[PDB]
Amino acid sequence: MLRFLNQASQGRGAWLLMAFTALALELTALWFQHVMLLKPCVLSIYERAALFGVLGAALIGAIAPKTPLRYVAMVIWLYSAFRGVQLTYEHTMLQLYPSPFATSDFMVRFPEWLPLDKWVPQVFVASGDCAERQWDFLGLEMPQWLLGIFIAYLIVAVLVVISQPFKAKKRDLFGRGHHHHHH
């Protein structure tokens, strides 16, 4: 049952399986555009960073999910959990509620202090309109589906994180007070 989940998850094979899954979607997709001659957008590229970043999180996390490393790897998993989900919303709202500013659509704005984009414009430079539909499943745009996965991934980490032995009665001090006010 649940206990087993912690067993299968605490295994590397399982972790490696999570990577191939997120990758399989990127590859199988990288082919659709290669033939469908599809072009990425500003947001699309940004969203790719949210997951692409997580993928890297699964590579380092699968190093030893039995040590405090959890907080270390989940740091990226969670970052995408709240932000990834919150962002995925902007796409949905705008998609069903188109009303942008003047011409905010001005390529990707990033500080020249991070050659991550300058030294690598290949997977950063945007080209095309954002929110446009070029391919859908069951009558749903990819962005909508991909979001479906984001939720799934958000659950495996939140559940696998809490699956930790937890318990422990010690826990000396935890959280500041400061609420006595003043006369």
DSSP 3-state of 79: helix
Residues in the chain, how many? 183
- Determined by NMR
For helices 142-162 and 42-61, give the axis angle rounded to 10 degrees.
30
Burial pattern 94-120, b for ≥16 Cβ within 10 A else e, equals: eeeeeeeeeeeeeeeeeeeeeeebeee
Give the Cα separation of 82 and 79 in Å (integer): 6
For CA atoms 166, 167, 171, 175, give the dihedral sign: positive
Give the Cα separation of 45 and 108 in Å (integer): 9
| DSSP code string of 106-154 | -S----TT-HHHHS--TTT---S-SS--S-EETTEEHHHHHHHHHHHHH
H or E stretch including 73? Answer: helix 69-96
* Domain annotation for the chain: domains and CATH numbers: 1-183 (1.20.1550.10)
